[PDB]
Amino acid sequence: SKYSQDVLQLLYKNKPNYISGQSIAESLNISRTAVKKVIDQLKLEGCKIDSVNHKGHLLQQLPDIWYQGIIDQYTKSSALFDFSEVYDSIDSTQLAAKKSLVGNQSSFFILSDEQTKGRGRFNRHWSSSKGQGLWMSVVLRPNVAFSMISKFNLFIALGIRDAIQHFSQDEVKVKWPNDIYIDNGKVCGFLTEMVANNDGIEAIICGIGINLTQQLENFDESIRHRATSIQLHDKNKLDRYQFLERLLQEIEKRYNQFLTLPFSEIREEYIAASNIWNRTLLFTENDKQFKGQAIDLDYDGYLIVRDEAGESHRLISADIDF
């Protein structure tokens, strides 16, 4: 229904109080009968809405579906995010962000319950199971130099890690430069692209995929031993809206840190949260591939590596396997 999101938004905004159906009707300039029909539909879609006879309605719990009217409430209260686009299915939120950013200077994000052509780094396929993960692309407008842009990944990694950690009973670690792990399982990967020239950056687009409630059987046989979800490390039922709120809050906090603090101020924190140390790694560089150890993380965020031939390397980035 056309007013379904608006009814949902009024229910969300009035928590924890009940609102009468009459009040919803006067707000949306529709009939009492249209409001009850919308509320039935929302209940059908799995919204837990308590209705009592003289009080009205109380949104108790959302289903595992993204709802524009709810996310709209998140962007209205965000200084950073001007708006959001919430899709049920899409080729890729990253493809949609790169089209939507052209010709404007807005900061926004794009969410989809499923992706049919999710892509990771180097155009590797990314599994985006409907209803089971957060598939999102974030467009921001950092007015920064190239010598500074690579640090965004280091800061954002810590925000994602903290957001996940808030819901994980197990330790959440960061695999430099763009992987979040729980024990031995990849729970998130992200990818940051930019539109730029030597005069500056028009936008960055950070594509974030986080496995929320996959059962092991929900991962393809090829990635099952290296993928995990937040639910597999949470004694309580993970609530995708509670997590998204925490995740937007940490992204905002770490983005403002990235714009105002040198990497030196999170370097120790980043090292302490990393899981790449004391462990041999597999580096892929075009056709060649070599092994190495992560020795240090310098003040610019570069990984210092000792390869198997004993040579040292200072890497702004790499793709490494365990």
Which does residue 98 touch among its own copies, ligand N3G, none (CB within 5 to 8 A, set by kind)?
its own copies
In the list 19, 71, 139, 191, the residue contacting its own copies (rule: CB under 8 A) is: 191
Q: Which stretch binds its own copies (CB under 8 A): 185-193, 245-253, 260-268, 271-279?
A: 185-193
Among 112, 192, 213, 214, binds its own copies (CB under 8 A): 192
Report DSSP letters for 97-165, one per residue: HHHHTTT----EEEEES-BSS-B-GGG-B----TTTEEEEEEEE-----HHHHTHHHHHHHHHHHHHHH
15 binds its own copies per the rule CB under 8 A: no
Which single residue is written with the structure tokens 């924190």?
Answer: 269
Q: Which long-range contacts (CB under 8 A, 24 or more apart) does 312-319 make?
A: 316/150, 317/150, 317/177, 318/177, 318/283, 318/284, 318/285, 319/121, 319/122, 319/283, 319/284
CB neighbour list of residue 290: distance below 8 Å, 6 or more residues apart: 283, 307, 308, 309
> Which span sits near ligand N3G by CB under 6 A: 117-125, 154-162, 230-238, 290-298?
117-125
Toward ligand N3G, which CB reaches closer, 124 or 314? 124
Check: CB of residue 133 under 8 Å from CB of residue 106: no
Strands 83-87 and 108-112: parallel
Determine, following the binding rule CB under 8 A, whether residue 287 of this chain makes contact with its own copies. no
Choose which of 202, 220, 265, 321 interacts with its own copies (CB under 8 A): 202
The CA–CA distances, whole Å, from 164 to 182, 236, 245, 247, 252 equal 9, 14, 11, 8, 15
Task: Give the range of 46-54, 59-67, 81-89, 194-202 binding its own copies by CB under 8 A.
Answer: 194-202
Question: Is 117 flagged in the annotation as binding?
Answer: no
Decide which of its own copies, ligand N3G, none touches 170; Cβ closer than 5 to 8 Å per partner kind.
none
120 contact choice in its own copies, ligand N3G, none (CB below 5 to 8 Å, kind-dependent): ligand N3G
Q: Is 121 annotated as a binding residue?
A: yes
Which does residue 316 bind out of its own copies, ligand N3G, none, counting CB within 5 to 8 angstroms by kind? its own copies
Residues of this chain that bind ligand N3G (CB under 6 A):
92-94, 115, 118-121, 124, 126-128, 135-137, 186, 189-191, 207-209, 211, 223, 227
